[PDB]
Amino acid sequence: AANDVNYSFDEAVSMQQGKGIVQTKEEDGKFVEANNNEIAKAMTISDMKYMDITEKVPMSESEVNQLLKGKGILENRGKVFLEAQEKYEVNVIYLVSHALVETGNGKSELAKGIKDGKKRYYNFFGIGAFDSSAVRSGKSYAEKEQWTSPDKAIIGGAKFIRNEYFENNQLNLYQMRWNPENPAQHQYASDIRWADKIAKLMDKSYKQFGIKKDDIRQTYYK
Ligand SMILES: CC(=O)N[C@@H]1[C@@H](O[C@H](C)C(=O)N[C@@H](C)C(=O)N[C@H](CCC(=O)O)C(N)=O)[C@H](O)[C@@H](CO)O[C@H]1O
Ligand SMILES: [Cl-]
Ligand SMILES: [Cl-]
Ligand SMILES: [Cl-]
Ligand SMILES: [Cl-]
Ligand SMILES: [Cl-]
Ligand SMILES: [Cl-]
Ligand SMILES: [Cl-]
């Protein structure tokens, strides 16, 4: 069976509302727990969130660096975002947009990485535990993978997204966030607006460069 439609919307909502399941929302400058009604509203299907991001797009290094101009630690790293796109077959507009949301347009202090020994570790995609503490103990995905440079963190993030999400039939933002095939497991983030934020930047970049959209899917539930 290639049939990944497993749950009704109501069944999925109740699972997303389950015990100790971290769903969060930005209010008054920081993240708080989302209520059950906010969760249900967020997972409701309304198209960048629903677009397959497992294909390459024809963006040159010049075009990618345009997008990255004024983006902090990510500025003038378009060549490496493209190396990631071609190596791992990950949409570069998606990849850039995801990094921009997570790193605060490349300007956040956490985007400048975490020191340990003579190395510093970088993480631009919110992958695993990434804080002072976790790097110390070695319970950090970034350290395990030795993302010792920004370029390694770009390539490594794409490798992770491809191998852990795209190869797990989570092919667009909605599936990455809400995993309708298996609700409330293997979800990329706790922010209920995670997909919205990335999708917004993707859509701007699609309309800036006139890029053609890949497949859209809006059917996920019984
Ligand atoms: C991309 C990422 O890290 N999103 C984590 C998410 O973990 C997902 C499922 C994951 O893909 N985790 C990766 C790092 C890993 O491949 N799976 C688990 C790590 C579990 C974790 O991050 O806590 C493992 N192999 O041991 C975790 O559930 C949630 C609440 O803690 O906080 C999100 O920010
Ligand atoms: Cl959780
Ligand atoms: Cl070019
Ligand atoms: Cl993220
Ligand atoms: Cl969403
Ligand atoms: Cl338009
Ligand atoms: Cl389509
Ligand atoms: Cl549906």
Numbering used by the authors: 33 to 78, 83 to 258
Please quote the paper that reports this structure:
Two groups of enzymes, muramidases and N-acetylglucosaminidases, cleave alternate but chemically equivalent glycosidic bonds in the NAG-NAM polymers. The S. aureus Mu50 genome (an MRSA strain with vancomycin-intermediate resistance; VISA) encodes five N-acetyl­glucosaminidases belonging to glycoside hydrolase family 73 (GH73 family). The crystal structure of AtlE and its complexes with substrate fragments described here provide insight into the mechanism of NAG-NAM binding, whereas a comparison with structural data for lysozymes and their complexes with substrate fragments enabled us to seek out the structural differences responsible for docking of the two alternate glycosidic bonds in the NAG-NAM polymer. The compact α-helical structural core forms the lower part of both domains, whereas the R-lobe and L-lobe contain short α-helical and β-strand regions, respectively.
The structure has additional five amino acids (SNAAA) at the N-terminus remaining after cleavage of the His tag by TEV protease. In the MDP complex the NAM and alanine residues are unambiguously resolved by the electron-density map, whereas the positioning of the atoms of the d-glutamic acid residue is less defined, as indicated by the electron-density map. The superimposed structures show similar positioning of the carbohydrate rings, yet different positions and orientations of the peptidyl extensions (the T4 muropeptide in green is pointing to the right and the AtlE-bound muropeptide MDP in red is pointing to the left), which provide insight into the difference in specificity between N-acetylgluco­s­aminidases and muramidases. The reverse is true for ACOD substrate binding. Indeed, Figs. 8(a) and 8(b) show that in the L-lobe and above the −2 and +1 positions of the lactyl moieties of NAM residues bound to the AtlE surface, there is sufficient space to accommodate the peptidyl extensions. The absence of AtlE activity against NAG substrates can be attributed to the extended but not twisted conformation of the NAG substrate, which disables productive binding at the −3 and −2 positions.
